[PDB]
Amino acid sequence: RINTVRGPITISEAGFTLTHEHICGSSAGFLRAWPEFFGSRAALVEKAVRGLRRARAAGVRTIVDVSTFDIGRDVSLLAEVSRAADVHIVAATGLWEDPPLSMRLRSVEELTQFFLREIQYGIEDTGIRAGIIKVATNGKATPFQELVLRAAARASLATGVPVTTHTAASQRDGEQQAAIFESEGLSPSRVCIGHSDDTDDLSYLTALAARGYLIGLDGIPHSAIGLEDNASASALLGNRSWQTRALLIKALIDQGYMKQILVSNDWLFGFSSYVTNIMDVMDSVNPDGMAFIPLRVIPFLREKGVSQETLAGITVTNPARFLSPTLRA
Amino acid sequence: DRINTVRGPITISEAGFTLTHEHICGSSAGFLRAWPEFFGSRAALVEKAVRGLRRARAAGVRTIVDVSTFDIGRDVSLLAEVSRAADVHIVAATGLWEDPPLSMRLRSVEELTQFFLREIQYGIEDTGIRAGIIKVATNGKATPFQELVLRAAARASLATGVPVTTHTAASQRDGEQQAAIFESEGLSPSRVCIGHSDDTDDLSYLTALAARGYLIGLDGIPHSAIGLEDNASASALLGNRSWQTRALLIKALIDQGYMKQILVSNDWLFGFSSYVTNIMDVMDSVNPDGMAFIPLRVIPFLREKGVSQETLAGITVTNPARFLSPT
Ligand SMILES: [Zn+2]
Ligand SMILES: [Zn+2]
Ligand SMILES: [Zn+2]
Ligand SMILES: [Zn+2]
Ligand SMILES: [Zn+2]
Numbered sequence: 001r002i003n004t005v006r007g008p009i010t011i012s013e014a015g016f017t018l019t020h021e022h023i024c025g026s027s028a029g030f031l032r033a034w035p036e037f038f039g040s041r042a043a044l045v046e047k048a049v050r051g052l053r054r055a056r057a058a059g060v061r062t063i064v065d066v067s068t069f070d071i072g073r074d075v076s077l078l079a080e081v082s083r084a085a086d087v088h089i090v091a092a093t094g095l096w097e098d099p100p101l102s103m104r105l106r107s108v109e110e111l112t113q114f115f116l117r118e119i120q121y122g123i124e125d126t127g128i129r130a131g132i133i134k135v136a137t138n139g140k141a142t143p144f145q146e147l148v149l150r151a152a153a154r155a156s157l158a159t160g161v162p163v164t165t166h167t168a169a170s171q172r173d174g175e176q177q178a179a180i181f182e183s184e185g186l187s188p189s190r191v192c193i194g195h196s197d198d199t200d201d202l203s204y205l206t207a208l209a210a211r212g213y214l215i216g217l218d219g220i221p222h223s224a225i226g227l228e229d230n231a232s233a234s235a236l237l238g239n240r241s242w243q244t245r246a247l248l249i250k251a252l253i254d255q256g257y258m259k260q261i262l263v264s265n266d267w268l269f270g271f272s273s274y275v276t277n278i279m280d281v282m283d284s285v286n287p288d289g290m291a292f293i294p295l296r297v298i299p300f301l302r303e304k305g306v307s308q309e310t311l312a313g314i315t316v317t318n319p320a321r322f323l324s325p326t327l328r329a
Numbered sequence: 330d331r332i333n334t335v336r337g338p339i340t341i342s343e344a345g346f347t348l349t350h351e352h353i354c355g356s357s358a359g360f361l362r363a364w365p366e367f368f369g370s371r372a373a374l375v376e377k378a379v380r381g382l383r384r385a386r387a388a389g390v391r392t393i394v395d396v397s398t399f400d401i402g403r404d405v406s407l408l409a410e411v412s413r414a415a416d417v418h419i420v421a422a423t424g425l426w427e428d429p430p431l432s433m434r435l436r437s438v439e440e441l442t443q444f445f446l447r448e449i450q451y452g453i454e455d456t457g458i459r460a461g462i463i464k465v466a467t468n469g470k471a472t473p474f475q476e477l478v479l480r481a482a483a484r485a486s487l488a489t490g491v492p493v494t495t496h497t498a499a500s501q502r503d504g505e506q507q508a509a510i511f512e513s514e515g516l517s518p519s520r521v522c523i524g525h526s527d528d529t530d531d532l533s534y535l536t537a538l539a540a541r542g543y544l545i546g547l548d549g550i551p552h553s554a555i556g557l558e559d560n561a562s563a564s565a566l567l568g569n570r571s572w573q574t575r576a577l578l579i580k581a582l583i584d585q586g587y588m589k590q591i592l593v594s595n596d597w598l599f600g601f602s603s604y605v606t607n608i609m610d611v612m613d614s615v616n617p618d619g620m621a622f623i624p625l626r627v628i629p630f631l632r633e634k635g636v637s638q639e640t641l642a643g644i645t646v647t648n649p650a651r652f653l654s655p656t
Contacts, residue, residue: 026432027358027430027431027432027433028357028358028359028360028363028430029358029359029399029402029430030358030430030432030433032454032455033358033399033444033448033453033454034432034444034447036443036447037432069359069363070430072359072430072432098430098431100357100358100359100360100400100402100428100430100603101357101428101602101603101604102356102357102360102367102402102602102603103357103360105602105603105604105605105606106606107606110606113366114363114364117364117366118363123363124362124363125362272431272432272435273430273431273432273435274431274435275435276435276436276437276440
C-alpha cells in the first residue's frame with residue numbers, strides 16, 4: 001500500500017498516476033493567512049475539484065502533489081479536493097527552495113526527524129502521512145541543500161518512500177544530486193530527477209537513466225510560445241514548445257529507457273509564489289490543466305508510433321513501482 | 330477608546346503596565362503546526378508560556394504586545410490560549426519581519442497594504458482576532474522589498490490609526506532611513522516606535538529621533554551574553570553589553586527630557602526556532618525571570634538611581650496606552 005490524503009490504497013488502485021503536480025504552489029502559512037489572494041479558499045477548492053474531475057474523465061486516477069512545507073502544502077485542502085474529485089492524492093514531505101529560517105538553521109539529523117515525522121506520524125495534526133520526499137537544487141547545491149538531500153536519503157532508507165527532485169536541468173543538477181544520494185547508499189530506482197524536460201541534453205538524461213534513475217519529464221505543457229511579450233511568463237515557462245518537451249519522452253523510449261520515464265504536467269490550480277497574474281496566464285495557455293498529459297501528450301505520441309501498452313507502462317506501471325514503498329534499511 | 334487584543338477589544342485603561350515588544354514564540358510561518366516537537370510539544374510550549382506570563386503578571390504586567398508577524402510564525406490561536414490562561418492581555422501584530430517567503434516577497438506595495446489592512450480590520454487567518462500594531466524590519470539599508478513593507482505599513486497605519494513598531498540594526502542608525510520613508514508617506518512620528526534602540530550606545534542618534542517625535546524602543550534590556558563568551562552563537566545574537574548598560578539608556582533618555590517617548594520591553598520569548606537549536610535554553614539560563622525582568626529587575630535598578638515611581642508609571646502605563654490607542 002501507498003499512503004494518500006484519504007488513507008492507504010493498494011498499489012493497483014493508484015492506476016494512471018501523474019507523479020509531479022500541485023494543488024496550490026504557495027508558501028507556508030500563506031493560504032490560511034491570505035486566502036483572498038486566491039479569490040477565496042472556496043473558489044480555489046472549486047477550481048481544483050473541477051480541474052481534477054477533468055483529469056479523472058481523461059483517465060487520471062492518482063496525482064502526487066509534490067508541494068512541501070515551503071510550497072505552502074495544506075494537506076487539509078488536498079484531502080478536501082481528493083474527496084470531492086475522487087482522485088487519489090499522494091502528499092509530500094521534504095524541502096523546496098524557499099525554506100524559512102526555522103528550517104535553514106536545522107542540522108541534517110534534525111531535518112531527518114522532520115521528514116520522518118511527516119512520513120511515519122503525519123502531517124501537522126491531520127494524521128495524513130507523506131508518500132514521497134521532495135528536494136531541490138537550482139545549480140550547485142548550497143551547503144543547506146546538501147543537508148536536505150542527505151536527510152531525504154536517510155528518511156527514504158528508513159521508510160521505503162521514494163525521493164523526487166527539483167533541478168535546474170540546464171546545469172545538469174541531476175549529477176550532483178545522484179552523487180549525494182549514492183554517498184548515502186540510496187538506490188537510484190527510488191529517485192526521480194525532476195524537471196528533466198527543461199533541457200534538450202539527451203546525453204545527460206540517458207546517462208542518468210542508464211544508472212537506474214527515474215527521469216521526470218514533468219513540465220510538458222510549460223511553454224510561453226505566443227506570450228513572448230510577457231517576460232515573467234517567458235522566464236517561468238520557457239520558449240520551448242510542449243511538442244519539443246514531449247519528443248523527449250519518445251527519444252528516451254527510442255533509446256531503450258521506457259522503464260526509467262515518469263511524466264507529468266507540473267500544473268497547479270493556485271500560484272502565489274510568483275507574479276500576481278501568473279495562474280491566469282498559465283490557464284490561458286493550457287486550459288486542460290492536469291488533463292494535458294492524457295488528452296494531448298498520449299495522442300501525440302501514439303501517432304508517432306508509441307504503443308498504447310508502452311504508454312500504460314509509463315503512466316501506470318512506472319509510478320506504481322516508484323511509489324510502492326520498498327523494505328526499510 | 331479601544332485596543333484590539335487576542336481576546337477582543339479592551340478599553341485603554343484596561344491595558345495597565347504594558348510590555349510593548351515581546352514574543353510568545355519566535356518561529357516561522359507554518360512551523361509550529363508542522364513541527365511542534367521542535368518545542369517538545371505544543372502542550373509544553375503552552376505550559377511554558379502560561380507559567381512565564383503568570384510570573385510577569387504577578388510582577389505587575391497586565392498587557393504584552395506580541396510583535397510576531399506572519400514570518401515570525403505568529404500563531405494567534407496560541408496567543409489567545411496563553412493570554413486566556415495567564416490573564417494577561419496580548420496585542421497581536423501584522424506586518425513583516427526579515428524572513429518573508431516568496432508569496433510575500435513577490436507582492437507590490439498595494440498588495441501588502443491590503444494584507445496588513447486585512448489583519449487589522451478583518452482578522453488574522455480565520456480567527457476573527459485583529460492586529461493592534463504593525464511590525465516592520467530592516468538590518469542596515471533597506472532592501473527594495475523592505476522599502477515596500479515600510480510604505481505599506483505607513484499606509485495601513487494612516488488608514489486605521491494603529492501604530493507602527495520597528496526592528497533595526499541600531500548601530501547602523503536604521504531608524505533615520507525608516508523615519509525618512511515613513512515621513513515621505515505622511516506618517517506622524519508619534520505613531521512610530523523605533524525598536525531595538527537599546528542595541529546601540531549612540532545617545533545622539535536616539536535623541537535626534539526623539540526630538541522629531543519618534544518613540545524609542547528600549548526593548549532588549551535583558552539580552553546579554555556576559556558570562557557566555559565561549560558561545561559564539563549566543564554572543565552574536567545577545568551581544569556583550571550588559572543589561573545594566575542597556576537599562577542606563579532608559580535613565581539617560583529620562584535625564585535628557587524624553588520620558589514621554591520611551592517604550593521598555595524585554596524582547597523575550599518562550600520558544601525560539603528561527604536560530605540555533607539550543608538558544609532558548611541558553612537564554613533561559615541567563616534570564617530565568619523571562620518577561621518579568623523589566624518589573625522585577627529594571628524598575629528597582631532605576632528607582633535606586635533616583636527615577637520616580639511616577640516617571641516609571643508614565644513609561645510603563647501612560648506611554649504604551651497613548652502609543653496603542655488608534656488615532
Ligand atoms: Zn520544481
Ligand atoms: Zn512542481
Ligand atoms: Zn513503443
Ligand atoms: Zn527584532
Ligand atoms: Zn522581537
